[PDB]
Amino acid sequence: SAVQQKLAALEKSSGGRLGVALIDTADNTQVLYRGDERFPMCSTSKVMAAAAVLKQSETQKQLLNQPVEIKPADLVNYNPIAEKHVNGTMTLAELSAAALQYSDNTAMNKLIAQLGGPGGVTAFARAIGDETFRLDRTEPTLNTAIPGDPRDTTTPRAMAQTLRQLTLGHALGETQRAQLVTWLKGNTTGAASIRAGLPTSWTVGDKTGSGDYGTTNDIAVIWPQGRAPLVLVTYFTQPQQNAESRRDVLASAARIIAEGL
Numbered sequence: 001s002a003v004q005q006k007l008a009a010l011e012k013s014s015g016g017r018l019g020v021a022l023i024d025t026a027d028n029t030q031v032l033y034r035g036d037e038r039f040p041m042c043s044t045s046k047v048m049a050a051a052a053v054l055k056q057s058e059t060q061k062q063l064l065n066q067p068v069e070i071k072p073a074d075l076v077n078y079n080p081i082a083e084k085h086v087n088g089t090m091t092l093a094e095l096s097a098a099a100l101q102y103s104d105n106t107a108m109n110k111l112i113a114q115l116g117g118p119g120g121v122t123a124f125a126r127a128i129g130d131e132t133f134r135l136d137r138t139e140p141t142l143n144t145a146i147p148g149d150p151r152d153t154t155t156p157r158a159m160a161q162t163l164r165q166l167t168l169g170h171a172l173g174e175t176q177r178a179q180l181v182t183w184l185k186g187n188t189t190g191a192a193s194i195r196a197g198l199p200t201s202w203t204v205g206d207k208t209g210s211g212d213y214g215t216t217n218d219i220a221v222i223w224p225q226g227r228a229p230l231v232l233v234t235y236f237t238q239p240q241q242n243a244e245s246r247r248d249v250l251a252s253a254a255r256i257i258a259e260g261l
């Protein structure tokens, strides 16, 4: 199809490996490019950790207000929000927001701890029907993005379906789903990625990811004005360990998808 030829050309021009999955919820049609190949999730995995904590809060009603101490030893490589609260506390809600909207790695590690380890995050994925997602490591080593390594990967198809279920479906309770949507819509790290290839009038909620091998990812829910929402996952990785990020590729892939609608 036209869109798949344009995505292939974009990939060829980029020098890397591009994975795309689009779900149009109007007719549940899907557009896939390398949709069943594994890609390193990097920080896109933070959505799953936050959603797992939200699921816990359906039974533990006060869980998100639980204070969690941030100690100096907790700080890792990228902690824009946690750094502001060293030797103090953040609630689980604040940690979830930080992980999602600022991609805070300390916050992610606290979420993982709350879930009983990476296996607890993976288990949540399995519980909502995602057989592909696997989280194996904590921050920052889950971002190594080594070619061929299946750790800390998923496929575009799987992540699109899971993101749909979490945000537009009913994998979470009503208050929890709404909270997740609010968090994603307030992301601060996404301006140069999917959002940049879409009409400025569309509302987007997204989570970016970055890692070694120039890995540059973004997963989004998109609410076009007067039109069913769309779920779009764009994963990109490159052959050189020290390659630069290529957010423009994700913007271009989004633009190509948007043109075909």
Ligand SMILES: *[B@@]1([O])O[C][C]([C][O])O1
Pocket (backbone or CB within 6 Å): 042, 043, 044, 077, 078, 103, 105, 140, 143, 208, 209, 210, 211
């Ligand atoms: B994710 O991918 O977003 C930023 C941080 C950097 O380690 O991880």
